Design a protein around this ligand. Structure first.
Ligand SMILES: [Cl-]
Lengths: 296, 303, 305, 303, 295, 296
């Protein structure tokens, strides 16, 4: 059964944005109906058909690995202490604020899950990954980031007939680019992501900045890696369209329920659901460069 | 016999854009009613009349080669697996996605059809085309892209009395420019930071530069081919925001009035899907050869 | 007798733009009611009065600036837009606005080009200027010669006007040929050397010559060859920047245009032509009202030798 | 007695702009109700209080100073019958608006002049808030130092009112001198600017806005035109408040009757054979805070 | 030429109603543009053609007698005493009430003008009028109002091929009907019962009185009148009917106010230029002196 | 000084009706600006001019009818509507329109009752009428007697008014007592309001039913009968010839924004409806005293 949805707070939830989180630039949010099923997967044949000049009906992918969206609703909370009159249902401003707290938790879970998939070398074939060792690492002046990125572009482009349009630089890999002689060179006759965009001719560069707690210690969610891929720019993402990946999301989510009063907690409680799972759909549309930002 | 059209999805269809595809920049979409007929063609005399200071009624151009629009409707599909309750007609969000799949297929077909016409040297007279060989190719440092483009501009401007306003660089031709030593040394004298299409626009004094990036599957193996080849093309394409096949210009996508159209869905019990018929019947047509100029093989290796 | 106007297509006609035609930049469109009359003319006194501070203690409430000068005549020149039946699935019905709008554009372009030519015909006519408001460049004084001094010619033009009317000219018209002559003119190139630059652009010329707006005369007309509408000339003027142009306000010139034009009439079916026909009216005439606000530099763009 | 107001033409009048006139940049328009009264004046204490951190719930800064007088100075906009197809009918908003613009311009130029008469009068400034440049100190001399003059002006204001000036007025002649000034020409020599611009001077002199006094008005009997803003330079703190109030500390305000400009419904004058619209815009510029201003006389005169 | 019209007050002016005045029930207001001209007149042939089954354009009347619309604008006035602040233009409510006063004056003049035309026996042929004398008068118990009314009905119906749809009873005639033994037998005697009894669509009562040379007189006299008056909700002077009030298109108009410093009042000019015209005599029938004493 | 007005409650106040109160049928509410002034009075000449025909386009362009007569004085008599906190769940907030309107209705009825009484004080004062415009029924002339003739008394009244102003009176006021006397009067029989309307030919009959405690109560309209010409104008104006008007300050009734009274523990709305009934045209009225009193 559906819960009673608060449409104003649900609309607010849908407009929630976290600009420094980049998971959705690799795994765009696309609607599905089933909590369990199979990832519609795009191999060499799917990308080839996708870009074959054109049988009135069109399917590109095949049923691949199973997926599982785990129901993971949380409860937003407006404590009575923030209200003049706690006997009444909270206003939309307090309700919305409480909801942003849970959406941010769900946003950070999502980011981490996106990183765990895109940066898993086990997902890629030999031609779509490298692991930089010693002086090949971007922290060494003897390395060649541009060569590494051009190899990455050719691999994808040759596999799927399209140029990759997203490059993810981890915080560490970007830092390295900022000290690299072969990249500093370019600054003299012009370091920013915009410079690297033009240099490497990739539509969009995203930086993996998010960190996560791992006693007094934080770890980079996106590691020391660099990743490139073709991610559909469709403003209406569809799990059926050939692309590197999608966030499989239950249609209509995020949803915020009408609040109920919890007398133990002395709070108004809003159920918030945003049931989703990132899924790697088209491996040949991705390329992983491990350990670029580690010390040489 | 017409179909029951879905106005909301048809409106959505009319707003679909594929910004990396450039065929519509050489062949703007203009409305026609007849599926077969003759291309309204613009020769030397049509362009001369067009630009003659002035009959209460105005006609340019003549009935030229035949055109044929092939009815090519596809069927968008929403599978029941993507619906919580498939017994109901799908919502606009799911129907819209299904429609986009078929519009993209049509968009790529259109792209290829445009290239097949614009880049056919048999469509141009000798003064409106060149074929670059060896060190004349833009991949050679001895080549002169700027001179090739100026010659192109002059040929068209001299023929129709208007400056060409659209320059098509294939991906390979653009890459050559980016490594060309003569062009690289122009950058310091501009506010550009590198060889971008914005700088080349200013350097060559052409209103708009479009890059032919599309690739399609070719052969029975694993290869993809550049839709726009290694070529460069320049032309006068009307900037009219309401394109009309009757107005002198290089070319048009002759398109059935009202298209694209999306029909209301029907349930297909064998496919277990809701099906939306999608129509966008059109054909690119070259109307004004003198408004175009083809530079073949610019982006191929010098040796 | 009025016609039955189609308000939607009339609104569409009023939004019609031709960005490369510059005639309206010298002769802004301003409404009149009469097809025949006298051009409201602005001489030295008019411009002086225009920039005279209101007299304290005066009881006068109203002000005119110009005088009735030379006659003008707007020739009724309505054309007929046509939507052929072959463009329609069902020609028995009135065409949709998309087809009607397109048919109207055709005739508006014809009118636009005729306007362009009439503007050039007036502004570039040396007979309309007094000797202090024109020059004719000969030989090495022509801008195609490295020995010429475009900057000096233009500063002389600016001074002539500003001294006459007490305002800086704000419009500079460079013909295509005169602009070409400037692109690599050695004096101009040397002047911008320190900025790291190898050719001259409009924006550079605006800053160098301190003119609000530079417009380029690019239009050509068939003469098997084409002639430049704006010839090899350069022109400077004070053209009012008023967003609601008025024939009564001191300025170099105006396009006297019947109020409400352009108008598009409801279509009729023409069985002979097998077409729906929309009458289109845009009755106008460019008029030079203020010679002292203009300056003509003839032959700047002609070869020196 | 009130006159019957035309609200559409009144709204039009309120939107009227003259971008090359700068008086309102020194004397922003602020509403009053009384045609005569005392200028609400801001001395050193006023500005101290204005920026002092907080038994009085109410806030007042100024004191009653010299009298002001707004002189009723309505004009009549005129639409002649020759401009109308049918003069028996009240003119359309397009003809009425145009006729109104004519009188608003007249009132705009008068205002511009009155502003200059106040702001540029050295008798209104104490010794620390003015300078008169003579000989080689003038900005036309290569031996002068505009930057030093401008910094001295800034410091004088900042030390008086605790705030930096945010407006710098360069007369036409002073700006021209700056373009030919060897100290400044050297600064442009390091950039890619073709000329010395007000944007560079803003950054160089660190003033929020530079406004240029270009307006000229007929002078004497013959053919002369004089610069409204003379050869001078002026600096000041002028309130940026998008809804200006005469009670708020500022160098100056244009005291203006509430609701003005107002356009009246027209009447037909059978003598003039015209439709007549009464236009009222009763105002007077007022110097409210001399300590927030600074006058540099004769900067643009020959050395 | 024109003044500035106040559209709000002009709109108010056009909705002005005086329900006890009946002139517009005989002479419906129809628009014209000319202040002088000829009355589009409907004779026997006009009414025949009007009701003939049926080259592409339709006209029925002939140019008859001249008419003249006399410009007769008045000035509505709001005195300063009625305002808290008379320096300001008056509110719409004050303005509107000042205008109602001039409209009533014009309404009473129109009422008299209508009666002057409709009740003039010189304007009817012998078959379209009667003069009741002695015991034929409705004040007499020996009179027969029903016979008089049926005779009137037949006269019009046989002339124009349509039943008359308006009966004007003067106050005096109505009073006589209320006392008449024949009508009393058919029963209170009201207009609704006489409507059904005489089978006329609408009965209107002429109650208006005006000042006379030093008392008052009934505008509609002691008379009774019947006619065919077009029920058209958009009256047109070209449509066969008994009469029309020829009125300048767009009237009544209220002008924007001006301040009169001599009167110390705001003045609104009010125009409602019109004239009643009898266009179709065969569509009317006059019964004179019904309501006068038998002796 | 003006007060801050509540426009919603002021509009509500303007729609207030007391259908059993008839004072406004004799003294229609008409706007004035001055609290003190002179009554615009209509004598024989005013009514004569009012029904004089003005031909188009005669010399006179402006139309006045009355003369300045007796002084009038409107006494400022604002009251305070009250919403007590006991009627509110949360008294800390401004009351809703439902509670405010109810509080305002209370004060408007008080004002309505005072008006009714003032109207009767003026209309039923025989000292305000000339001898041709009044009668005092004594003994068997009283309508309580079977020997009386109500119809003759009413026709006499109609003729006196019509003869004086050239218009028939359109209002007849029957006191409760006089109406009761009519219902079983034998001459009338050989009775309802609609019956008497038709019988006596008067446009509208109004019945004076209001009472006041004086453990007894007094009829506001006494045992009297009154007749008059009262303007039917839907926008009454004090400048238009008529028997009477209620001179009322323009804009009234007005309700002010509420204020919290901490001593009364109530929200208070100032309500103002400053008015005074005024007899402007005596010749347009006629008084029949003592019609409904016992014959013995
Ligand atoms: Cl680029």
């Amino acid at each position: 059964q559906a819960r009673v949805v608060d449409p104003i707070l649900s609309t607010h939830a849908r407009g929630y944005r976290q600009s420094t989180l980049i998971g959705k630039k690799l795994f765009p949010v696309a609607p599905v109906a089933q909590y369990g099923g199979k990832i519609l997967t795009f191999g060499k044949e799917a990308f080839r058909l996708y870009n074959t000049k054109r049988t009135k009906r069109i399917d590109f992918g095949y049923e691949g690995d199973p997926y599982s969206i785990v129901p993971s609703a949380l409860e937003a909370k407006v404590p009575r202490e923030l209200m003049r009159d706690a006997s009444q249902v909270p206003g939309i401003d307090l309700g919305a604020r409480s909801v942003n707290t849970v959406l941010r938790i769900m946003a950070l879970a999502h980011e981490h899950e996106c990183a765990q998939i895109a940066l898993d070398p086990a997902k890629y074939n030999a031609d779509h990954k490298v692991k930089l060792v010693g002086s090949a690492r971007w922290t060494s002046p003897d390395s060649d980031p541009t060569k590494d990125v051009e190899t990455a572009k050719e691999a994808i482009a040759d596999s799927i007939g399209m140029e990759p349009n997203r490059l993810m630089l981890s915080r560490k890999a970007l830092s390295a680019c900022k000290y690299h002689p072969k990249l500093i060179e370019r600054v003299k006759y012009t370091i920013t992501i915009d410079m690297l965009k033009a240099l490497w001719e990739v539509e969009e560069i995203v930086v993996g900045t998010a960190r996560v707690a791992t006693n007094d210690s934080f770890g980079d969610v996106w590691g020391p890696d660099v990743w490139l891929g073709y991610v559909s720019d469709n403003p209406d993402p569809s799990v059926e369209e050939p692309s590197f990946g999608y966030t499989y999301q239950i249609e209509g989510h995020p949803l915020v329920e009408v609040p109920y009063w919890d007398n133990n907690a002395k709070s108004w409680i809003y159920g918030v659901s945003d049931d989703n799972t990132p899924a790697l759909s088209g491996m040949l549309a991705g390329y992983l460069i491990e350990d670029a930002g580690l010390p040489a």
